[PDB]
């Protein structure tokens, strides 16, 4: 038996004017009239019973998370008192399993079209877990010097497709990322992890006692004791808090197309640049990503530009600045 | 006395999405909820009777012109069967004056806020016309190497502020326009002209006979006889037909600020760049010009950009390419 832990803490700000501050990233229907989370949950339910799926998410989002995922038990959504990043959410979650039990940690914010290959990889990671223990990550081959992704160096090969992690470095500078990619000895951290519960808990004790010490005796369904416990706990990701530090990290190579729905360029990577139609007019404008609504849009003299038009507003953004659309949300509110 | 000839033949395509292809530039209300033509007419009625004012325009715009200018008698709107640019229009309008009567030729697409300084200049030109004859221009001091204007080379003084023209060059290439400015020796042609009716006609006779040969004996208010003549007549601007060639051209420096309403860049020159408001959010974007309709527009990571939103559509244009909004209209229709 295994558990799945779904981390829903999203920041849909970057996706304005689709997203309002009301709709967290997780509930955005970027594809197929289905939220990121819903697609993620349907993917899990292909091989898993809802009983064994957990979602860790801030309390405001609980009531909606329930509406979105009616199959889930109520006891299975854990209400957090504060947004403390992934490490505390992982710990709190992993505690809900039996010491022995494998836990698959999954972000809600990803896109993975191939469910079967996804499970093919998970299965292959599980046998790995049983054979070698330690903490497992899923490596994606890099196609660019991305600065918001973690980077895993490949090490001693355990078996075909499975290696020890020589090192792990989260969110590096650009030129370093560039060198990692030029190297070939690195893969992107997918953001999904697999570990046995007891082992991960012991690694956090060593790696980040501040977390371990103040959360070890806590009941995740007692909101009050979890509130007061979180007051002593920091905001920090599993990656910084444990993976960079831990010497028992493993990586399996993901055999599936993967994407982090990070900002609008991200969506363009999936769909491709927009072509001229009756409602999109391009004069001296190349590599242009445009979403119309009621009326036509004309882009003149511009390239590598993103334009989005909803009832909420109109975004005109240069591609290298897609991450700064969050700032639009600071100013506009 | 004196006549005024307003030329109304303009294409508003560069002011999409404000303008529809149905509407020409003359009927656009860029300022004060009055049409470019309407401002031009009111400027002229400051010192003239409607009866001495003549508009020359395509037959398709006549009914619409009467509604805009109800003070204008119907006989003073000369319906043209085709657009042949300004040389033929000037000819048929000027014909209607008497041999010795000076004719003031005015585009409909100018913005001249100081009516009084305008007439101060016309007065000074009328006087100079009596003393020196020939064809008059009004020179603006050039701020930039504009390729869409005519350039007047300043020659000998007749008297202070009034000069013979050493050279009139219409629509030079960029590098010539840059040299013209550097030299200090040139003025922009305002597009307005003043001449005695008989003198202009002889000047077209020598400069561009096609126009004279075919229109000399034609009653401009006899539509069918004008229709037949215009099949034989070329489409050519007064500036290329006569002004570049003539040896009888003088210039009076304009005592007034002036502006040709060429494209959205022009409107920005008048109004200045947009600043941040409720409906206009700017992030890493300077020198932006933004007009909103019902929604917030956010511009991220872009400078020197025009964004215009209206029920007809949305325009996103880099400033340098403001001419090319024309090509948007052609693709869109
Ligand atoms: N409950 C909870 N969830 C959170 C919190 N912070 C983040 N999450 C959730 O954890 C996941 C990661 O959030 P991101 O903000 O997307 O992290 P990241 O910068 O994308 O970086 C991580 O994932 C990358 C790929 O998606 C990795 O490359 C990187 O190494 C790291 O694991 C998302 O599902 C998000 O909803 C939190 O404080 N509380
Ligand atoms: N009746 C009629 N009028 C016309 C036609 N074509 C143009 N016009 C009118 O003639 C005037 C000048 O036309 P534009 O098309 O704006 O001319 P331009 O290229 O701006 O160039 C002229 O003006 C510039 C500055 O205003 C000058 O710099 C340049 O030398 C030239 O005189 C405008 O009022 C326009 O309505 C036509 O086929 N028929
Ligand atoms: Mg003009």
CB pairs under 8 A between A and B: 121
Say how far apart CA A271 and CA A251 lie, in whole Å: 29
Residue B23 CA, ligand 3 centroid: distance in Å: 16
Which of A107, A148, A211, A239 for mutating ligand 1's site (highest number of atoms within 8 Å of CB)? A107
Residue B263 CA, ligand 3 centroid: distance in Å: 9
What residues of A are in contact with residue B332 (Cβ under 8 Å)? 281, 296, 298
What is the DSSP secondary structure assignment for residue B278, as one 8-state letter? S
Say how far apart CA B64 and CA A13 lie, in whole Å: 49
Q: Environment class of residue B255 by beta-carbon count within 10 Å: exposed (0-12), middle (13-18) or buried (19+)?
A: middle
CB A12 within 8 A of CB A266: no
Q: Which helix (DSSP H) or strand (DSSP E) does residue A115 occupy?
A: helix A115-132
Query: Is A56 known as a binding-site position?
Result: yes
CA distances from A272 to A263, A305, B26, B105, B299 (A): 14, 13, 41, 53, 22
**B332 touching A (Cβ < 8 Å):** yes
Q: Locate A19 and state its tokens.
A: 């997203």
CA distances from B281 to A288, B296, B310 (A): 21, 7, 18
> Quick one: CA dihedral A138, A144, A148, A153, positive or negative?
positive
Say how far apart CA B197 and CA B91 lie, in whole Å: 9
What residues of A are in contact with residue B13 (Cβ under 8 Å)? none
Of B301, B321, B327, the CB nearest to A317: B301
Ligand nearest to the CA of B7: 2
Residue nearest atom 2 in ligand 2 by C-alpha distance = B9
Q: Is the peptide bond before A290 cis (omega within 30 degrees of 0)?
A: no
Neighbouring CB atoms inside 10 A of A180's CB total 20
CA distances from B116 to A225, B45, B71, B254 (A): 80, 12, 21, 12
Q: B154: which strand partners?
A: B165
Three-class secondary structure of residue A288 per DSSP: strand
Say how far apart CA B270 and CA B261 lie, in whole Å: 10
Say how far apart CA A277 and CA A286 lie, in whole Å: 14
Say how far apart CA B94 and CA B135 lie, in whole Å: 13
Which of A280, A281, A319 is the best substitution to test chain B (most B C-beta atoms within 10 A)?
A281
Q: What are phi and psi of A143, to 5 degrees?
A: -120, 5
B1-333 under CATH 3.90.550.10, yes or no: yes
Q: Is the peptide bond before A17 cis (omega within 30 degrees of 0)?
A: yes
Q: Which residues contact A196 (CB under 8 A, 6 or more apart)?
A: A99, A100, A101, A102, A103, A129, A133
State the method. Answer: X-ray
Three-class secondary structure of residue B162 per DSSP: strand
What is the DSSP secondary structure assignment for residue B31, as one 8-state letter? B
Cα B188 to chain centroid, rounded: 12
CB B170 within 8 A of CB B239: yes
Cα B13 to chain centroid, rounded: 15
Mind telling me how many Å the CA of B322 is from chain A's nearest CA? Answer: 8
Strands (E), chain A: 3-8, 53-58, 77-80, 102-107, 110-111, 135-140, 150-159, 162-170, 186-196, 249-253, 259-260, 280-283, 288-291, 297-300, 305-309, 314-318
Three-class secondary structure of residue B61 per DSSP: helix
What residues of B are in contact with residue A317 (Cβ under 8 Å)? 298-302
Residue nearest atom 19 in ligand 1 by C-alpha distance = A148
Is A328 in contact with B301 (Cβ distance < 8 A)?
A: no
Q: Give the DSSP per-residue string, B280-327.
A: EEEES--SEEEE-SSS-EEEES--SEEEEEETTEEEEEEGGGGGGHHH
Query: Is A7 known as a binding-site position?
Result: yes
Closest-CA residue of chain A to B323: A300
Cα A307 to chain centroid, rounded: 25
Query: Is A202 known as a binding-site position?
Result: no
What is the DSSP secondary structure assignment for residue B34, as one 8-state letter? B
Q: Closest by alpha carbon to A30, among A264, A203, A252?
A: A264
Q: Which helix (DSSP H) or strand (DSSP E) does residue B54 occupy?
A: strand B53-58
Say how far apart CA B289 and CA A83 lie, in whole Å: 39
Which of A15, A21, A290, A301 is the best substitution to test chain B (most B C-beta atoms within 10 A)?
A301
> Which resolution in angstroms does this entry have?
2.7
Q: Give the DSSP per-residue string, B64-127.
A: HHHHH-TTS-GGGEEEESS---HHHHHHHHHHTS-TT-EEEEEESSEE---HHHHHHHHHHHHH
Ligand nearest to the CA of A251: 1
Say how far apart CA A296 and CA A290 lie, in whole Å: 10
Say how far apart CA B141 and CA B256 lie, in whole Å: 10
Tell me the Cα Rg of chain B.
21
Ligand nearest to the CA of A93: 1
Cα pseudo-dihedral B231, B234, B235, B241, rounded to 10 = -150
Say how far apart CA B13 and CA B315 lie, in whole Å: 12
What residues of B are in contact with residue A325 (Cβ under 8 Å)? 283, 298, 300
CB B289 within 8 A of CB A245: no
> CA A11, A16, A17 angle in degrees (round to 5)?
145
Residue in this structure with the two tokens 């690694």, named with its chain if needed? A203
Q: Which residues contact B220 (CB under 8 A, 6 or more apart)?
A: B78, B92, B93, B95, B96, B226
Is A301 in contact with B317 (Cβ distance < 8 A)?
A: yes
**B72 touching A (Cβ < 8 Å):** no
Is B313 in contact with A296 (Cβ distance < 8 A)?
A: yes
Ligand nearest to the CA of B86: 2
**B284 touching A (Cβ < 8 Å):** yes
Residue nearest atom 15 in ligand 1 by C-alpha distance = A10
Mind telling me how many Å the CA of B328 is from chain A's nearest CA? Answer: 7
The binding site of B consists of 7, 9-10, 12-14, 25, 56, 80, 84-85, 108-109, 260, 326
Is B324 in contact with A284 (Cβ distance < 8 A)?
A: yes
Query: Is A312 known as a binding-site position?
Result: no
Say how far apart CA B186 and CA B142 lie, in whole Å: 8
Q: Which residues contact A130 (CB under 8 A, 6 or more apart)?
A: none
Of A295, A296, A321, the CB nearest to B300: A321
What is the DSSP secondary structure assignment for residue A132, as one 8-state letter? H
What is the DSSP secondary structure assignment for residue B235, as one 8-state letter? -
Say how far apart CA A226 and CA A332 lie, in whole Å: 33
Neighbouring CB atoms inside 10 A of A102's CB total 20
Residue nearest atom 34 in ligand 1 by C-alpha distance = A107
Q: Closest by alpha carbon to B133, among B246, B237, B22?
A: B246
Please give the number of the atom of ligand 1 that sits closest to the Cα of A84: 38
Is B297 in contact with A316 (Cβ distance < 8 A)?
A: yes
What residues of A are in contact with residue B307 (Cβ under 8 Å)? 314, 316
Neighbouring CB atoms inside 10 A of A61's CB total 21
Pocket of ligand 2 (CB under 6 A): B 7-10, 26, 56-57, 80, 83-86, 89, 107-109, 148-150, 170, 188-191, 239, 260
CB B305 within 8 A of CB B288: yes
The binding site of B for Mg(2+) consists of 109, 260
Three-class secondary structure of residue A110 per DSSP: strand
What residues of A are in contact with residue B18 (Cβ under 8 Å)? none
What is the DSSP secondary structure assignment for residue A275, as one 8-state letter? P
Tell me the Cα Rg of chain A.
21
Is A298 in contact with B324 (Cβ distance < 8 A)?
A: no
Pairing of strands A297-300, B313-318: parallel
Say how far apart CA A154 and CA A142 lie, in whole Å: 13
Residue in this structure with the two tokens 């033509």, named with its chain if needed? B37
Closest-CA residue of chain B to A293: B313
């Amino acid at each position: 038996v295994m558990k799945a832990l779904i981390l829903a803490g999203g920041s849909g700000e970057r996706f304005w004017p689709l997203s309002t501050p009301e709709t967290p990233k997780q509930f955005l229907k970027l594809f197929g009239n289905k939220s990121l989370m819903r697609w993620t949950f349907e993917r899990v339910l292909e091989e898993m019973d809802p009983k064994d799926v957990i979602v860790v998410t801030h309390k405001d989002y609980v009531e909606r998370t329930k509406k979105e995922l009616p199959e889930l038990p109520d006891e299975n959504i854990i209400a957090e008192p504060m947004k403390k990043n992934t490490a505390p959410a992982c710990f709190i979650g992993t505690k809900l399993a039996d010491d022995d039990e494998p836990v698959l940690v999954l972000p809600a914010d990803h896109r993975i079209p191939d469910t079967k290959k996804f499970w093919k990889t998970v299965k292959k990671a599980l046998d790995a877990l049983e054979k070698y223990d330690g903490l497992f990550t899923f490596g994606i081959v890099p196609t660019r010097p991305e600065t918001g992704y973690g980077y895993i160096e490949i090490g001693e090969e355990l078996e075909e497709g499975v290696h020890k992690v020589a090192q792990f470095r989260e969110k590096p500078d650009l030129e370093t990322a560039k060198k990692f990619v030029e190297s070939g000895r690195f893969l992107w951290n997918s953001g999904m992890f697999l570990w046995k519960a007891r082992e991960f808990i012991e690694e956090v004790k060593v790696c980040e006692p501040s977390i371990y010490e103040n959360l070890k005796d806590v009941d995740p369904r007692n909101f009050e004791e979890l509130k007061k416990a979180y007051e002593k706990v920091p905001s920090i990701s599993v990656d910084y808090a444990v993976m960079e530090k831990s010497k028992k990290v493993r990586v399996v190579k993901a055999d599936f197309e993967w994407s982090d729905l990070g900002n609008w360029s991200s969506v363009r990577e999936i769909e491709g640049y927009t072509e001229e139609s009756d409602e999109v007019i391009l004069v001296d404008s190349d590599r242009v990503f445009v979403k119309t609504h009621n009326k036509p849009i004309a882009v003149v003299g511009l390239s590598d530009v993103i334009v989005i038009d909803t009832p909420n507003g109109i975004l005109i953004c240069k591609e290298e600045y897609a991450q700064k659309v969050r700032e639009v949300v600071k100013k506009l509110f």
